[PDB]
Amino acid sequence: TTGRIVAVIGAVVDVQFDEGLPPILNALEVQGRETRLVLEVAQHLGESTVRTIAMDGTEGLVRGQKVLDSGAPIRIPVGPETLGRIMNVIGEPIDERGPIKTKQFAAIHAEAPEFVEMSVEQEILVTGIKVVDLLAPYAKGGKIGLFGGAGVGKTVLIMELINNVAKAHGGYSVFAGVGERTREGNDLYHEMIESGVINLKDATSKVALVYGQMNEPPGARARVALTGLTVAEYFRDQEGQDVLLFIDNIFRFTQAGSEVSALLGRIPSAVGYQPTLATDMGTMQERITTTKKGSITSVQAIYVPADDLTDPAPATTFAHLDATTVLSRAIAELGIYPAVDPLDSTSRIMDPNIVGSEHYDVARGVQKILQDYKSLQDIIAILGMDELSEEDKLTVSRARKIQRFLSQPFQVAEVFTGHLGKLVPLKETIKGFQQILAGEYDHLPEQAFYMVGPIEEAVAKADKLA
Amino acid sequence: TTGRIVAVIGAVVDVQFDEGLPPILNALEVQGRETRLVLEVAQHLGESTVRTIAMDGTEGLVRGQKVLDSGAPIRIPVGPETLGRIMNVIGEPIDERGPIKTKQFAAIHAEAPEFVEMSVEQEILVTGIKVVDLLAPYAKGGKIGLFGGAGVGKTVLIMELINNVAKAHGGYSVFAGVGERTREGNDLYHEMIESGVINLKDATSKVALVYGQMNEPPGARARVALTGLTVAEYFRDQEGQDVLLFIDNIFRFTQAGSEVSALLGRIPSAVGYQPTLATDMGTMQERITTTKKGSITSVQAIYVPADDLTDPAPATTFAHLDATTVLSRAIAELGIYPAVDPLDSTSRIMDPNIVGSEHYDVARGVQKILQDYKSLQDIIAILGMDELSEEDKLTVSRARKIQRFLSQPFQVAEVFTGHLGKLVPLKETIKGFQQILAGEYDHLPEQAFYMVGPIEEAVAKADKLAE
Amino acid sequence: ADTSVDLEETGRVLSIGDGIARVHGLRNVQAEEMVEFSSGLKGMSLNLEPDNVGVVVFGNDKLIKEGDIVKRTGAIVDVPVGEELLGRVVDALGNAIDGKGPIGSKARRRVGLKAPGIIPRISVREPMQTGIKAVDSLVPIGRGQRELIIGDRQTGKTSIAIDTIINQKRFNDGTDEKKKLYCIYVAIGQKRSTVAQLVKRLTDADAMKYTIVVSATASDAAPLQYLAPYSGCSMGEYFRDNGKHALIIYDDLSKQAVAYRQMSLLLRRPPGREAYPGDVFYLHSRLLERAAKMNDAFGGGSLTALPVIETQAGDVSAYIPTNVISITDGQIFLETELFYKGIRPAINVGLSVSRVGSAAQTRAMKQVAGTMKLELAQYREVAAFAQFGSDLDAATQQLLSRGVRLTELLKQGQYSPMAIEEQVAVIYAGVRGYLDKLEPSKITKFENAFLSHVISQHQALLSKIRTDGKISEESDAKLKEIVTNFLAGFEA
């Protein structure tokens, strides 16, 4: 079918059809252009007109221009031949390595797995990161979220996890760059090549890359997540594969939505966001999941605007995760990295019947002492410690040593910590924290605990501090 | 006249009349319904179409449905045969006891008493509640308001006043439940009966009841108060009696209006409220009043959204009262019930010329010390208490004891406090505080002053606590 | 003369977008009636305008296009109801989602029915035992009562509800049909894997048998999420209107409000305070008024509701939070501060209330916890007023000594709902002062030891307290004897 462009406003192109109106979600190709311009139908305004969302800049379009119904929704190359390749929202390669020659093609809009298809196995995923492992442990096939205001550690944490987990993972990985920096895509691609997870020589690549960055028009940013998502769904269900899915940043998808929403003509909801915010997050978040057919461990970075976690975007995302790592500017500014807020991160696995009571008791032990320190802080703030009770001052000592021992050097952040990256084994974490709690190091100085791996290194640092 | 329904959107129904357009405020009845559906005309949209508010559910209505102009605003059965009964927004019995055979009927909409109809007598109305009496005395025939956020004591306080005052009152009482809990109208009805204020066998009923609870559509909620108030105005004017009016909760009248407001096509005023809030409140509040003909003693519960007393609604209502009892979740949170805020409660009779200087000097004496202590609170919090002057650590003492002596076990909250309800007489109150202020109990422990009636119980409780 | 598509019982889609169809025709539809789309997709007639009908769609509007035929159903929205649903997982319309076969439903019920009036009910008097000391002792819940569970994300709100559902096996596995409680669990805006996790645990506890689970999750259309509560309510009234007893959990009413807000804005209804419809209070009042206690004249059955609401930054004064606190018969407020501090449940004594009071409590419990609530309130205050031991007397040293010991007893783990007599035994020990000399740290351990002893050895005293339902003078004497002696041997 051939329609005609009737109106153009930014990324919202209205096209009229005479015979055969395309259903909603169908991709149309604008005619008469140097490059592909896909339009995704969004709604039937009546009068044989359809309101659509462009997938690329709309400059140059002209009213009356011809548009062709592709007959289906954006469809993209899916299969193992996407492994080691970089692709677009609309599935075209952007790594200058030729066509992605796949047997099948999948449409980016699918329904979420049914209730009966759900899984409930809960396995802990150890990452080697002290704070995460001890207090808000991730889980295989689970949904993890790293909340962070600008420049707090979301990406560095994804990188370190890619390093500590993705690198020795049997099975595939999918990195979906949504609304982030292009240089980062470039930094990663080349790094992936270097460590050999991307091999441009053989078919041994274990990563497929999808990108729709900070330079794309809203509609592209609004759909690349769906695109990375689809790639991952193929490995899960069509190959019963154990997938790893990294997304930086899923907040950008929602923001993209807010960008076009007025153009679609909708009364805004709170904070200027689109009234369809939750359902849009929902039908999308619900496909990022493990099932009986396959496993999807997904780590999603969630940018928090103005640092406000009460913002509709981040606020609505908590409910979709199994584990959350809430990063803090306040902590970061103290020099503690990763800047994880220990009393604000959680994990549905923090259950005695899953991590064992030893783990469950150290974990709750650490939080209780930090919570206690937290209430003393108001008074410590005007009057310092003098007036504090001998007992209270011991919580404070221990809390400040536990707070420091929660920090740790990442390989990925070596250039900034000035120290060699460390990976601490769970039992080493459970332990080191026990002792601290138990008063076995009340003699060491705080600084001994800052930026170290295992407790054994904290004792040493103390000697060096003399 | 006969109109047709042209549009239905929630509680708002637009009707088109071919000939004869029913005036604003007129009630129309929807034809073809198992139950009586009344639509109050709200506006003349033009084109012989009127916009109206439904007095009940709009489910099953159909475009084109017939509607007859009743020719007059909602009119209800008013008179003595309303006593002991339970009525609707539209005046229908809802107690299953048959028709209400009144001689007359009254329209719920009416003008408020003229300026030359006002009265200015000011008699204290003792309640038995230490706090109210001491600091913010109610006045017979005056307008009283109980302000409070969700769950701080508005209703229980209204409950103990019905007991300590309504029960002995020689005159009628009208209790209008506006947008509150259905469970509650059933608790009160059956309590009225068990105590004979309501008599189902004879004509000894001394209380009429009207209800438009929270399970009703905005429309019903925007009018029950009117129905309630209308019943009360009858006993005031046509009989000339001393009426006691209880409304719980008048905020619901205003929330009702804000709920249809947008469907009435209005730009919102601040905080979401409708732009006609104050005037809507004014033409109503101005009827709830004592005149030269009769006397009304209205006790209105006033909800405070988000606990913010500056919210356009609670905020707009202060001016309509002669006495105000402000309840606070910060006080309640400490276990001090009734949770009245001693520094935010006021009465127009707290005048030496009206209650006397002993009453007055004590009250103000108690308020100074609580204020004095409020100011120090935040400071000894951090800097501690050592540096304080013995002069100042005595006011911390006395204040903390007064703070307690102001609590009291209500007779309607034994299920809550686990304590027998106490009613204290005005002189037992004035005296008790006078002595605490005088230093006459600086030896007893604070706890001795918590949840007790008269000062003697505080002394006895000290011993019991003495071990 | 093909006359199948006249504009009185059928219409044609003028436009469709974001789940709202503007249907032309449908001249005889009734407000709130259900209609059908060519695609087998059902919708509901919300706006009846002069020239169009605004239809909310119960499903993906992607299958709807301009021009589609829409057909009346003649029926105001309803759903399957009755005993057939027990042990099954249904969507917001009644359809099964446990792929365990069709529901054998013989009854139907309108999702939106006004709550029974004044006359058909009777004061709440029968307890609804949660299994949680803190709750059953300080903020008692009776049948026909609405008690709200409110708190920030992760403070434990759902747990209260699960423990409650699980605690009901006691009576359901029993003989007495009046003590039985059928449960309904409505998930709204939640995530499918979480619900799947939820129904697993219920199954593992042998609780599904008496539970129905209405699920309206994160990807379900706004209108399904919106309806879900009314749907589930109606399934609970079946039991309520038939002299049986039901318990419904609305988890949570926050996500529903969002759904309502979305559905509503997309219909172009002017946004109000905080962007929600001017009638969000009404949205929840209408629903929760339905939980009720009917008099013997109407079967004496009941419906008890436990709606959940999520606060932000523990701010309970917030508009929605207070909107709902002003409808229910009390609230259970959970704080993250208390939770981290070790106080789990994180119930905030001071801020939680039960408007039913002791009328929803057995005499055994009333006897032990009659004044405890205001005691703990008054304890929290002085505990603050002496965060500097300000030359404190005895009456307050005693107050702080009880306060701390009692606080430890109200603590509780998960999935182990206690029996009423078990609660009375342990609170008893504290409230009576027998523990005023034990070390706070000991208290939890002591309760496990003590309870062990009485359950094993003394079930005669437990069965009597349980049976008489009160604490007689001899039971009270047999108890004093046990605690004091065991306590001593315990502190050897």
XYZ file of C-alpha atoms in Angstrom, chain C:
492
model
C -31.321 -6.213 2.985
C -28.336 -7.252 5.039
C -29.442 -5.798 8.382
C -26.816 -7.259 10.678
C -24.865 -4.009 11.064
C -27.447 -1.327 11.984
C -26.031 1.460 14.126
C -28.109 0.610 17.179
C -26.529 -2.596 18.388
C -23.283 -2.252 16.479
C -20.824 0.532 15.663
C -17.602 1.050 13.726
C -14.254 2.214 15.064
C -13.720 5.876 14.131
C -10.179 5.818 15.539
C -8.003 3.772 17.908
C -4.852 4.645 19.836
C -3.340 3.963 23.231
C -6.089 1.566 24.187
C -8.986 3.929 23.608
C -11.442 3.240 20.796
C -13.783 6.015 19.631
C -16.658 3.869 18.281
C -19.345 5.370 16.012
C -22.910 3.975 16.268
C -23.571 1.853 19.385
C -26.716 3.894 19.830
C -28.211 1.575 22.417
C -25.117 0.837 24.554
C -25.447 1.512 28.267
C -22.771 3.362 30.222
C -20.340 0.716 31.534
C -21.518 -2.060 29.251
C -19.165 -4.532 27.647
C -18.759 -4.505 23.864
C -16.918 -6.829 21.481
C -14.365 -6.029 18.769
C -14.086 -7.967 15.462
C -10.894 -9.411 16.943
C -12.627 -11.133 19.883
C -11.220 -8.345 22.048
C -13.600 -7.043 24.729
C -13.810 -3.380 25.799
C -15.968 -1.290 28.125
C -18.190 1.699 27.324
C -17.011 4.565 29.535
C -17.819 7.845 27.737
C -21.224 7.994 26.052
C -20.873 11.166 23.977
C -23.271 12.807 21.565
C -21.391 11.585 18.520
C -19.239 8.696 19.730
C -18.721 6.119 22.510
C -15.315 6.199 24.272
C -14.388 2.508 24.694
C -11.607 1.351 26.993
C -9.975 -1.828 25.590
C -9.301 -4.922 27.663
C -6.231 -5.949 25.658
C -3.689 -5.005 22.999
C -5.268 -2.366 20.765
C -2.860 -3.434 17.994
C -5.550 -5.734 16.604
C -8.046 -2.878 16.317
C -8.225 -0.620 13.284
C -10.379 2.257 12.118
C -13.574 0.788 10.642
C -13.750 -2.378 12.752
C -17.211 -3.544 13.774
C -17.963 -3.288 17.507
C -20.931 -5.224 18.915
C -22.916 -4.667 22.094
C -23.089 -7.513 24.620
C -26.076 -6.101 26.380
C -24.240 -6.829 29.570
C -22.714 -4.540 32.144
C -19.218 -5.927 32.873
C -19.169 -8.986 35.143
C -17.144 -12.103 35.943
C -17.183 -15.741 36.968
C -17.732 -16.172 40.728
C -17.851 -19.029 43.224
C -16.051 -21.987 44.713
C -14.821 -23.216 41.359
C -12.157 -20.512 41.327
C -10.408 -21.610 44.542
C -6.874 -22.839 43.875
C -6.889 -21.158 40.479
C -5.000 -18.240 38.948
C -7.268 -15.972 36.887
C -6.674 -12.753 34.907
C -8.697 -9.574 35.542
C -11.723 -10.972 33.669
C -11.918 -14.482 35.142
C -10.074 -16.419 32.424
C -7.646 -18.980 33.835
C -3.925 -18.306 33.389
C -2.591 -21.407 35.116
C -3.353 -23.314 31.936
C -5.079 -25.850 34.221
C -8.351 -25.855 32.286
C -11.537 -23.832 32.178
C -13.159 -22.757 35.465
C -16.428 -24.661 36.045
C -18.360 -21.483 36.821
C -22.106 -21.451 37.180
C -22.455 -17.990 38.713
C -21.505 -14.560 37.478
C -21.360 -11.194 39.236
C -21.079 -7.563 38.139
C -17.582 -6.241 39.004
C -19.053 -2.919 40.019
C -21.755 -3.237 42.673
C -22.391 -0.700 45.432
C -21.486 -1.864 48.927
C -24.279 -3.058 51.176
C -25.847 -0.211 53.126
C -26.365 0.492 56.796
C -29.159 -1.975 57.542
C -27.642 -5.201 56.162
C -24.523 -5.133 58.397
C -23.538 -5.832 62.014
C -20.541 -4.539 64.034
C -17.281 -6.428 63.341
C -16.817 -8.857 66.234
C -15.036 -12.010 65.090
C -11.249 -11.891 64.992
C -9.330 -12.407 61.720
C -6.036 -13.779 63.077
C -2.960 -12.866 61.093
C -0.531 -15.108 63.001
C 1.562 -12.051 63.718
C 1.822 -11.008 67.338
C 2.530 -7.358 66.601
C -0.612 -7.175 64.491
C -2.971 -9.469 66.370
C -2.001 -7.801 69.684
C -1.622 -4.102 68.823
C -3.728 -3.524 65.639
C -6.337 -6.289 65.797
C -8.234 -7.196 62.618
C -11.855 -8.420 62.806
C -13.943 -9.957 59.983
C -15.654 -7.406 57.735
C -12.805 -5.020 58.582
C -10.559 -3.175 56.129
C -7.007 -2.760 57.425
C -4.321 -1.155 55.215
C -0.734 -2.385 54.892
C 1.336 0.736 53.940
C 5.082 1.467 53.695
C 7.955 2.145 51.231
C 9.223 -0.368 48.661
C 10.622 -3.513 50.293
C 9.541 -2.774 53.891
C 7.687 -6.104 53.980
C 4.086 -5.216 53.074
C 3.367 -8.403 51.056
C 4.811 -10.613 53.723
C 2.115 -9.481 56.181
C -0.444 -10.633 53.594
C 1.222 -13.993 52.829
C 1.671 -14.931 56.471
C -2.053 -14.107 56.917
C -3.183 -16.344 54.036
C -0.954 -19.133 55.324
C -2.174 -18.775 58.905
C -5.705 -19.656 57.747
C -4.935 -23.361 57.215
C -5.496 -23.818 60.942
C -9.199 -23.236 60.561
C -9.635 -24.369 56.945
C -8.223 -27.782 57.690
C -10.560 -27.835 60.669
C -14.188 -28.820 61.044
C -15.998 -25.577 61.863
C -17.204 -23.847 58.726
C -17.780 -20.498 60.457
C -14.125 -20.160 61.351
C -12.971 -20.864 57.794
C -11.593 -18.066 55.636
C -11.297 -18.233 51.853
C -8.617 -15.902 50.534
C -8.261 -13.831 47.391
C -4.968 -12.328 46.288
C -5.099 -9.644 43.594
C -1.740 -8.750 42.043
C -1.779 -5.360 40.271
C 1.022 -3.847 38.157
C 3.270 -6.479 39.699
C 5.642 -8.691 37.638
C 4.659 -12.173 36.397
C 7.744 -13.877 37.781
C 6.990 -12.417 41.277
C 3.400 -13.645 41.165
C 4.622 -17.036 39.888
C 7.009 -17.008 42.856
C 4.032 -16.083 45.077
C 1.697 -18.827 43.918
C 4.557 -21.283 44.307
C 5.045 -20.533 48.020
C 1.279 -20.628 48.556
C 1.246 -24.046 46.907
C 4.210 -25.203 48.991
C 2.280 -24.136 52.133
C -0.832 -25.960 51.028
C -2.758 -22.705 50.908
C -3.733 -22.564 47.220
C -6.604 -24.914 47.965
C -8.412 -22.013 49.655
C -7.001 -19.096 47.626
C -8.022 -17.594 44.275
C -5.337 -15.386 42.646
C -6.565 -12.641 40.317
C -3.510 -11.435 38.377
C -3.348 -8.135 36.462
C 0.402 -7.669 35.892
C 2.813 -5.097 34.523
C 2.238 -5.798 30.826
C -1.568 -6.197 31.135
C -3.495 -3.281 29.615
C -4.222 -0.385 31.906
C -7.961 -1.250 32.000
C -7.228 -4.790 33.113
C -5.083 -3.498 36.010
C -7.789 -0.967 36.782
C -10.623 -3.563 36.865
C -8.640 -6.257 38.621
C -9.563 -5.031 42.127
C -13.319 -4.841 41.392
C -13.100 -8.237 39.708
C -11.447 -9.862 42.717
C -13.840 -8.073 45.056
C -16.892 -9.597 43.345
C -15.410 -13.059 43.705
C -15.107 -12.310 47.404
C -18.691 -11.128 47.760
C -19.899 -14.539 46.606
C -18.577 -15.908 49.883
C -19.680 -12.792 51.796
C -23.266 -12.978 50.618
C -23.552 -16.706 51.303
C -22.784 -16.796 55.014
C -19.188 -17.807 54.217
C -16.048 -15.780 55.051
C -13.555 -14.268 52.595
C -10.283 -12.311 52.877
C -9.028 -10.192 49.914
C -5.539 -8.640 49.517
C -5.321 -5.730 47.005
C -1.610 -5.729 46.200
C -1.214 -2.840 45.581
C -3.695 0.034 45.182
C -0.939 2.377 44.108
C -0.320 0.716 40.777
C -4.060 0.575 40.204
C -4.340 4.346 40.726
C -1.631 4.805 38.101
C -3.600 2.549 35.755
C -6.704 4.531 36.505
C -4.817 7.790 35.926
C -3.520 6.529 32.571
C -6.856 5.138 31.395
C -8.504 8.320 32.485
C -6.070 10.805 30.876
C -6.169 8.866 27.606
C -9.947 9.468 27.650
C -9.049 13.151 27.799
C -10.588 13.639 31.297
C -8.798 16.663 32.811
C -6.073 15.651 35.216
C -6.454 16.780 38.823
C -4.312 16.911 41.943
C -1.016 15.170 41.349
C -2.152 14.320 37.816
C -4.758 11.800 39.043
C -8.448 12.008 38.173
C -10.383 14.234 40.542
C -12.065 11.050 41.739
C -9.207 8.796 42.841
C -10.578 8.866 46.432
C -13.819 7.641 45.029
C -11.916 5.015 42.974
C -10.794 3.315 46.185
C -13.732 4.135 48.549
C -16.267 2.409 46.263
C -14.056 -0.691 46.285
C -13.122 -0.993 49.953
C -16.641 -0.160 51.199
C -17.517 -3.564 49.762
C -15.444 -5.394 52.409
C -18.135 -5.783 55.107
C -19.766 -7.841 57.851
C -23.362 -8.882 57.037
C -25.905 -9.498 59.809
C -27.412 -12.936 60.456
C -30.378 -11.640 58.479
C -28.051 -11.722 55.470
C -26.051 -14.850 56.228
C -23.617 -13.412 58.762
C -20.929 -13.869 56.083
C -18.202 -11.253 55.629
C -15.460 -9.821 53.419
C -12.221 -8.539 55.020
C -9.860 -6.416 52.936
C -6.137 -5.872 53.227
C -5.281 -3.248 50.573
C -1.597 -2.331 50.121
C -0.299 1.158 49.320
C 3.308 2.149 48.657
C 4.627 5.326 50.293
C 7.756 7.205 49.126
C 10.382 8.331 51.611
C 8.213 6.896 54.360
C 5.871 9.864 53.887
C 2.446 8.753 55.109
C 1.050 12.245 55.031
C 1.108 12.062 51.234
C -2.223 12.720 49.458
C -2.813 9.181 48.155
C -1.580 7.522 51.350
C -3.990 9.640 53.417
C -6.764 9.250 50.867
C -6.691 5.497 51.502
C -5.916 5.731 55.233
C -9.225 7.655 55.434
C -11.277 4.810 54.045
C -10.003 1.748 55.866
C -10.559 0.709 59.468
C -6.893 1.200 60.411
C -3.379 0.869 59.010
C -0.201 -1.104 59.590
C 2.716 1.220 58.861
C 6.059 -0.421 58.143
C 9.258 1.672 58.364
C 12.574 0.896 56.687
C 14.367 2.398 59.664
C 12.812 -0.156 62.037
C 13.388 -2.930 59.488
C 17.120 -2.242 59.156
C 17.328 -1.783 62.888
C 16.203 -5.390 63.363
C 12.559 -4.638 64.131
C 10.746 -7.035 61.777
C 7.936 -6.756 61.182
C 8.835 -3.052 60.853
C 5.460 -2.181 62.391
C 5.450 1.391 63.719
C 3.336 1.049 66.884
C 2.618 4.740 67.224
C 1.432 5.356 63.649
C -0.557 2.130 63.096
C -4.138 1.840 64.309
C -7.173 -0.437 64.277
C -10.505 1.345 64.397
C -12.146 -1.865 65.616
C -10.130 -2.008 68.834
C -10.426 -5.060 71.086
C -13.879 -5.933 69.768
C -11.915 -7.929 67.172
C -9.890 -9.727 69.843
C -10.357 -12.930 71.854
C -10.615 -12.231 75.630
C -7.334 -14.102 76.135
C -5.629 -11.549 73.908
C -7.587 -8.542 75.191
C -6.577 -9.641 78.669
C -2.861 -9.566 77.886
C -2.637 -6.715 75.364
C -5.409 -4.396 76.565
C -3.185 -1.417 77.400
C 0.090 -2.401 75.710
C -0.430 -0.243 72.636
C -0.535 3.129 74.417
C 2.218 1.839 76.710
C 4.611 1.279 73.817
C 3.607 4.660 72.334
C 4.495 6.334 75.636
C 7.668 4.243 75.718
C 8.944 5.398 72.355
C 8.567 8.998 73.511
C 10.561 8.743 76.783
C 13.035 6.435 75.051
C 13.664 9.499 72.919
C 13.486 12.036 75.772
C 16.377 10.286 77.560
C 18.723 9.661 74.597
C 20.510 11.524 77.325
C 19.830 9.852 80.707
C 18.323 13.042 82.156
C 18.175 12.301 85.897
C 15.491 9.703 85.239
C 13.211 8.500 88.008
C 11.979 4.947 88.494
C 8.538 4.992 86.919
C 10.340 5.841 83.666
C 13.237 3.428 84.195
C 10.566 0.773 84.605
C 8.849 2.191 81.526
C 12.031 1.857 79.493
C 12.687 -1.646 80.894
C 9.271 -2.947 79.865
C 9.314 -1.033 76.581
C 12.505 -2.720 75.412
C 11.522 -6.247 76.521
C 8.068 -5.966 74.957
C 9.589 -4.673 71.714
C 11.682 -7.795 71.407
C 8.647 -10.077 71.849
C 6.685 -8.419 69.084
C 9.546 -9.321 66.704
C 8.785 -12.273 64.406
C 10.187 -14.248 61.482
C 8.450 -15.159 58.233
C 6.084 -17.968 57.261
C 5.505 -19.066 60.890
C 2.111 -17.660 61.817
C 1.479 -18.376 65.511
C -1.712 -19.755 67.042
C -3.656 -17.362 69.264
C -2.910 -19.230 72.507
C 0.786 -19.240 71.553
C 0.736 -15.451 71.266
C -1.065 -15.103 74.599
C 1.501 -17.356 76.306
C 4.548 -15.301 75.155
C 3.044 -11.784 75.454
C 1.863 -12.836 78.925
C 5.413 -13.531 79.995
C 6.434 -9.984 79.039
C 3.418 -7.911 80.013
C 3.491 -9.489 83.466
C 7.010 -8.400 84.200
C 8.408 -11.911 84.412
C 10.989 -10.854 81.793
C 11.965 -7.455 83.236
C 15.223 -8.940 84.510
C 16.167 -10.978 81.448
C 18.629 -9.331 79.027
C 16.969 -7.886 75.935
C 19.347 -9.899 73.745
C 18.086 -13.045 75.431
C 14.360 -12.486 74.814
C 14.129 -13.882 71.300
C 15.958 -17.087 72.309
C 13.875 -17.395 75.460
C 10.642 -17.155 73.466
C 11.743 -20.070 71.274
C 12.693 -22.169 74.318
C 9.627 -21.278 76.380
C 7.146 -21.777 73.523
C 8.823 -25.090 72.864
C 8.304 -26.183 76.417
C 4.607 -25.280 76.696
C 3.707 -26.640 73.229
C 5.282 -30.019 73.930
C 4.723 -30.522 77.619
C 1.718 -28.252 78.427
C -0.749 -28.477 75.543
C -3.431 -28.802 78.222
C -3.033 -25.159 79.177
C -2.734 -24.146 75.562
C -5.874 -26.099 74.609
C -7.790 -24.546 77.551
C -6.722 -20.931 76.909
C -7.451 -21.646 73.285
C -10.781 -23.304 74.102
C -12.146 -21.246 76.979
C -10.811 -18.463 74.762
C -9.983 -16.646 78.008
C -7.380 -16.796 80.748
C -9.171 -18.212 83.782
C -7.790 -17.727 87.304
C -6.187 -21.160 87.422
C -4.773 -20.968 83.879
C -3.338 -17.643 84.856
C -1.852 -19.464 87.908
C -0.574 -22.467 85.976
C 1.078 -19.973 83.600
C 2.728 -17.836 86.298
C 4.198 -21.072 87.637
C 5.578 -22.285 84.337
C 7.190 -19.003 83.254
C 8.907 -18.117 86.525
C 10.345 -21.603 86.989
C 11.347 -22.227 83.376
C 12.771 -18.721 83.312
C 15.042 -19.546 86.280
C 16.264 -22.847 84.881
C 16.685 -20.887 81.653
C 18.950 -18.296 83.257
C 21.199 -20.903 84.895
